[PDB]
PDB file of C-alpha atoms in Angstrom:
ATOM      1  CA  UNK A 602     114.319 110.830  93.448  1.00 41.09           C
ATOM      2  CA  UNK A 603     113.387 107.209  91.954  1.00 41.15           C
ATOM      3  CA  UNK A 604     113.347 105.383  95.262  1.00 42.32           C
ATOM      4  CA  UNK A 605     111.672 108.444  97.121  1.00 41.40           C
ATOM      5  CA  UNK A 606     108.338 108.325  94.908  1.00 44.52           C
ATOM      6  CA  UNK A 607     107.996 104.611  95.309  1.00 48.92           C
ATOM      7  CA  UNK A 608     108.329 105.024  99.209  1.00 46.70           C
ATOM      8  CA  UNK A 609     104.681 106.659  98.750  1.00 45.00           C
ATOM      9  CA  UNK A 610     103.243 103.886  96.989  1.00 43.99           C
ATOM     10  CA  UNK A 611     104.424 101.267  99.939  1.00 44.75           C
ATOM     11  CA  UNK A 612     102.651 103.859 102.317  1.00 46.10           C
ATOM     12  CA  UNK A 613      99.565 104.683 100.490  1.00 47.04           C
ATOM     13  CA  UNK A 614      98.675 102.536  97.529  1.00 52.65           C
ATOM     14  CA  UNK A 615      99.047  99.052  98.995  1.00 50.50           C
ATOM     15  CA  UNK A 616      97.221  99.691 102.216  1.00 51.89           C
ATOM     16  CA  UNK A 617      93.638  98.596 102.962  1.00 53.00           C
ATOM     17  CA  UNK A 618      92.713 102.103 103.935  1.00 49.61           C
ATOM     18  CA  UNK A 619      92.797 103.776 100.707  1.00 52.26           C
ATOM     19  CA  UNK A 620      91.444 100.660  98.900  1.00 52.44           C
ATOM     20  CA  UNK A 621      88.320 100.844 101.306  1.00 55.09           C
ATOM     21  CA  UNK A 622      87.747 104.439 100.935  1.00 54.80           C
ATOM     22  CA  UNK A 623      88.770 106.106  97.803  1.00 55.15           C
ATOM     23  CA  UNK A 624      87.369 103.056  95.609  1.00 53.65           C
ATOM     24  CA  UNK A 625      83.973 103.778  94.114  1.00 54.64           C
ATOM     25  CA  UNK A 626      83.589 107.602  94.406  1.00 55.32           C
ATOM     26  CA  UNK A 627      82.166 109.616  91.671  1.00 54.09           C
ATOM     27  CA  UNK A 628      82.727 107.145  88.707  1.00 54.49           C
ATOM     28  CA  UNK A 629      82.132 109.459  85.666  1.00 55.94           C
ATOM     29  CA  UNK A 630      83.542 107.914  82.441  1.00 57.06           C
ATOM     30  CA  UNK A 631      80.525 108.168  79.810  1.00 57.77           C
ATOM     31  CA  UNK A 632      79.825 110.759  77.194  1.00 56.53           C
ATOM     32  CA  UNK A 633      78.636 112.877  80.007  1.00 59.42           C
ATOM     33  CA  UNK A 634      82.220 113.139  81.365  1.00 61.56           C
ATOM     34  CA  UNK A 635      83.248 114.147  77.954  1.00 64.70           C
ATOM     35  CA  UNK A 636      80.444 116.749  78.109  1.00 64.73           C
ATOM     36  CA  UNK A 637      82.184 118.631  81.049  1.00 64.20           C
ATOM     37  CA  UNK A 638      85.886 118.859  79.526  1.00 63.94           C
ATOM     38  CA  UNK A 639      88.300 118.236  82.252  1.00 65.21           C
ATOM     39  CA  UNK A 640      90.974 118.110  79.666  1.00 64.00           C
ATOM     40  CA  UNK A 641      94.076 117.051  81.978  1.00 64.21           C
ATOM     41  CA  UNK A 642      93.502 114.024  84.105  1.00 63.46           C
ATOM     42  CA  UNK A 643      89.913 112.475  84.771  1.00 65.95           C
ATOM     43  CA  UNK A 644      89.408 111.759  81.193  1.00 64.08           C
ATOM     44  CA  UNK A 645      93.145 111.224  80.761  1.00 64.39           C
ATOM     45  CA  UNK A 646      92.966 109.479  84.264  1.00 66.79           C
ATOM     46  CA  UNK A 647      90.151 107.218  83.087  1.00 68.64           C
ATOM     47  CA  UNK A 648      88.524 106.415  79.866  1.00 67.34           C
ATOM     48  CA  UNK A 649      89.612 108.300  76.664  1.00 67.88           C
ATOM     49  CA  UNK A 650      93.468 107.866  75.504  1.00 68.13           C
ATOM     50  CA  UNK A 651      93.968 111.577  74.633  1.00 66.34           C
ATOM     51  CA  UNK A 652      96.873 113.879  75.474  1.00 66.29           C
ATOM     52  CA  UNK A 653      98.092 117.014  73.846  1.00 67.11           C
ATOM     53  CA  UNK A 654     101.913 115.939  74.731  1.00 67.17           C
ATOM     54  CA  UNK A 655     101.697 113.390  71.886  1.00 65.70           C
TER      55      UNK A 655
ATOM     56  CA  UNK M 323     136.400 129.297  74.030  1.00 65.04           C
ATOM     57  CA  UNK M 324     132.779 129.799  75.562  1.00 65.79           C
ATOM     58  CA  UNK M 325     131.604 127.550  78.427  1.00 69.97           C
ATOM     59  CA  UNK M 326     128.062 126.662  79.109  1.00 72.40           C
ATOM     60  CA  UNK M 327     126.121 124.079  80.718  1.00 72.12           C
ATOM     61  CA  UNK M 328     127.421 120.356  80.191  1.00 73.85           C
ATOM     62  CA  UNK M 329     125.539 117.070  79.919  1.00 75.19           C
ATOM     63  CA  UNK M 330     125.970 114.153  81.995  1.00 74.82           C
ATOM     64  CA  UNK M 331     124.660 110.465  81.216  1.00 75.74           C
ATOM     65  CA  UNK M 332     126.485 107.625  83.141  1.00 71.28           C
ATOM     66  CA  UNK M 333     123.607 105.661  84.170  1.00 73.18           C
ATOM     67  CA  UNK M 334     120.675 108.059  83.404  1.00 73.38           C
ATOM     68  CA  UNK M 335     119.257 107.508  86.930  1.00 77.58           C
ATOM     69  CA  UNK M 336     116.936 104.689  85.872  1.00 76.23           C
ATOM     70  CA  UNK M 337     113.478 105.927  85.593  1.00 76.50           C
ATOM     71  CA  UNK M 338     110.179 104.108  86.164  1.00 72.97           C
ATOM     72  CA  UNK M 339     110.864 100.908  87.970  1.00 74.61           C
ATOM     73  CA  UNK M 340     108.872  99.053  90.920  1.00 72.29           C
ATOM     74  CA  UNK M 341     110.963  99.126  94.083  1.00 71.06           C
ATOM     75  CA  UNK M 342     108.278  97.273  96.087  1.00 69.81           C
ATOM     76  CA  UNK M 343     108.810  93.903  97.044  1.00 69.44           C
ATOM     77  CA  UNK M 344     107.246  91.501  99.342  1.00 68.07           C
ATOM     78  CA  UNK M 345     109.318  90.654 102.454  1.00 69.90           C
ATOM     79  CA  UNK M 346     109.411  88.339 105.585  1.00 70.11           C
ATOM     80  CA  UNK M 347     105.860  86.681 105.252  1.00 72.34           C
ATOM     81  CA  UNK M 348     104.748  84.736 102.240  1.00 73.51           C
ATOM     82  CA  UNK M 349     101.331  83.472 103.186  1.00 72.92           C
ATOM     83  CA  UNK M 350     101.509  79.808 104.381  1.00 71.50           C
ATOM     84  CA  UNK M 351     104.748  80.375 106.576  1.00 71.37           C
ATOM     85  CA  UNK M 352     102.910  83.045 109.040  1.00 71.80           C
ATOM     86  CA  UNK M 353      99.819  80.826 109.567  1.00 71.78           C
ATOM     87  CA  UNK M 354     102.171  78.006 110.854  1.00 75.91           C
ATOM     88  CA  UNK M 355     103.372  80.510 113.332  1.00 74.67           C
ATOM     89  CA  UNK M 356      99.971  81.947 114.034  1.00 76.43           C
ATOM     90  CA  UNK M 357      98.204  78.672 114.835  1.00 76.91           C
ATOM     91  CA  UNK M 358     101.615  77.541 116.533  1.00 73.87           C
ATOM     92  CA  UNK M 359     101.469  80.334 119.009  1.00 74.42           C
ATOM     93  CA  UNK M 360      97.920  79.461 119.516  1.00 72.20           C
ATOM     94  CA  UNK M 361      98.693  75.972 120.225  1.00 72.37           C
ATOM     95  CA  UNK M 362     101.588  76.887 122.465  1.00 72.45           C
ATOM     96  CA  UNK M 363      99.259  79.729 124.115  1.00 73.45           C
ATOM     97  CA  UNK M 364      96.295  77.431 125.373  1.00 72.19           C
ATOM     98  CA  UNK M 365      98.587  74.670 126.468  1.00 72.25           C
ATOM     99  CA  UNK M 366     100.695  76.874 128.825  1.00 71.46           C
ATOM    100  CA  UNK M 367      97.812  78.870 130.157  1.00 72.10           C
ATOM    101  CA  UNK M 368      95.915  75.786 131.330  1.00 73.83           C
ATOM    102  CA  UNK M 369      98.707  74.400 133.340  1.00 74.75           C
ATOM    103  CA  UNK M 370      98.554  77.308 135.558  1.00 74.07           C
ATOM    104  CA  UNK M 371      94.820  76.860 135.896  1.00 74.06           C
ATOM    105  CA  UNK M 372      95.550  73.270 137.269  1.00 75.44           C
ATOM    106  CA  UNK M 373      98.163  74.738 139.636  1.00 73.57           C
ATOM    107  CA  UNK M 374      95.507  77.308 140.721  1.00 71.26           C
ATOM    108  CA  UNK M 375      93.345  74.396 141.624  1.00 71.42           C
ATOM    109  CA  UNK M 376      96.111  73.177 144.084  1.00 75.17           C
ATOM    110  CA  UNK M 377      95.573  76.655 145.822  1.00 78.93           C
ATOM    111  CA  UNK M 378      91.861  77.009 145.245  1.00 81.03           C
ATOM    112  CA  UNK M 379      90.803  73.757 147.426  1.00 82.74           C
ATOM    113  CA  UNK M 380      93.412  74.738 149.898  1.00 83.40           C
ATOM    114  CA  UNK M 381      92.220  78.434 150.386  1.00 86.50           C
ATOM    115  CA  UNK M 382      88.511  77.424 150.864  1.00 85.31           C
ATOM    116  CA  UNK M 383      89.761  74.631 153.354  1.00 87.10           C
ATOM    117  CA  UNK M 384      90.614  77.608 155.829  1.00 88.98           C
ATOM    118  CA  UNK M 385      87.020  78.286 156.300  1.00 88.53           C
ATOM    119  CA  UNK M 386      86.031  74.370 157.022  1.00 87.81           C
ATOM    120  CA  UNK M 387      89.117  74.029 159.347  1.00 85.85           C
ATOM    121  CA  UNK M 388      88.075  77.101 161.430  1.00 85.82           C
ATOM    122  CA  UNK M 389      84.890  76.659 163.246  1.00 81.39           C
ATOM    123  CA  UNK M 390      85.485  78.980 166.415  1.00 84.69           C
ATOM    124  CA  UNK M 391      85.439  81.655 163.851  1.00 82.74           C
TER     125      UNK M 391
END
């Protein structure tokens, strides 16, 4: 599986297409993002270093 | 004796490692081939255009040579 997951990165992440499109869409990281409460990802994905796992 | 599920270690699969690595082209090397193909490209193309001139004058000569037409 270790090689299989990194095959997606060589296909999607390094490409110009994703770095042109998905970059700068719905940038929400402020106290307002905390005022919506997404819990998993979003806040975890960007900003606050918080998780229930730890 | 009671038998259940057994554990296996050996190498532990090796989790989280960058498999992505740069191959073939480096940067400066591909530009030498790129401009090199261009320099070979224009030089070989214009030689046929000079060879076309041998035909070009000779083809239009047929109209000048033929006046009973």
